[PDB]
Amino acid sequence: LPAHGCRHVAIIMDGNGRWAKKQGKIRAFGHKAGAKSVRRAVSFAANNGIEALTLYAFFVWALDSEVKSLHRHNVRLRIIGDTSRFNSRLQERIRKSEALTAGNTGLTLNIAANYGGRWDIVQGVRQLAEKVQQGNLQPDQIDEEMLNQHVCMHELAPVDLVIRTGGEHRISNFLLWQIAYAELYFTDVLWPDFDEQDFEGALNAFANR
């Protein structure tokens, strides 16, 4: 229902490294500029009626100072990816950040952490297998729609638009199942340089296409 027609944008945030290298700066400087650019994109999305923004870094700190900021901007924060590998002391900080913002009615921000598109499909398959083994589910009852409701973000609007910054033309095992019908938009802009007009240019391409 916004004029650009875009409910859910996903972004592969590539370019932090060469951005830093361009300035004779080490990579960490680029990742810091990258975090700034995330803040900028989150604010842009929320102000342009986007329901969901899903971000892929192609964190251990970020999730606390940012969380207060996100929360103040009425953003609902979710983390997608294999977070079982993580230590359960900051696994705790993840769940705390999620429940703290779970009530917010603005943008839903999904952050990919130890996320893979193939993994995403496989964890959903494992849940279906568990139901099969418990006797609930019959194998031939499994269809697209059912698997669809077991992959990440099934409860949000389908992904309308995938943006990849940084010049490369691949998905790199980001969303796979979820992008079957998504518009794909590639720009050479390095992620730290990606701004409101770049984002606006992406949405306008989506609307025009």
The yes or no reply on residue 207 touching its own copies (CB under 8 A) is no
* Residue that has been written with the tokens 């899903």 in this structure: 54
Stretch that binds its own copies, among 39-47, 49-57, 76-84, 140-148 (CB under 8 A): 140-148
Stretch that binds its own copies, among 38-46, 50-58, 106-114, 117-125 (CB under 8 A): 117-125
The strands making up 76-80's β-sheet, listed across from edge to edge, are 76-80, 108-112, 52-57, 8-13, 161-164, 183-186
Q: Which of residues 6-45 bind its own copies (CB under 8 A)?
A: none
Residue 75 burial (10 A CB sphere; 0-12, 13-18, 19+): buried
The yes or no reply on residue 115 touching its own copies (CB under 8 A) is no
For the stretch 173-208, what's the b/e string if a residue is b when 16 or more beta carbons lie within 10 angstroms of its beta carbon? ebbebbbeebbebbbebbbbbbeeebbebbbeebee
- Give, to the nearest 10 degrees, the angle between helix 27-47 and helix 65-72: 20
The yes or no reply on residue 143 touching its own copies (CB under 8 A) is yes
Q: Smaller CB distance to its own copies: residue 33 or 166?
A: 166
| Whether 120 is catalytic | no
The yes or no reply on residue 157 touching its own copies (CB under 8 A) is no
CA dihedral over 82, 18, 15, 70, signed as positive or negative: positive
The yes or no reply on residue 183 touching its own copies (CB under 8 A) is yes
**Is residue 200 annotated as involved in ligand binding?**
no
Give residues in contact with its own copies (CB under 8 A).
Answer: 116-119, 121-122, 125-126, 128-130, 132-133, 137-140, 142-144, 147-148, 168-173, 176-177, 179-186, 205, 209
Q: Which residues are catalytic?
A: 14
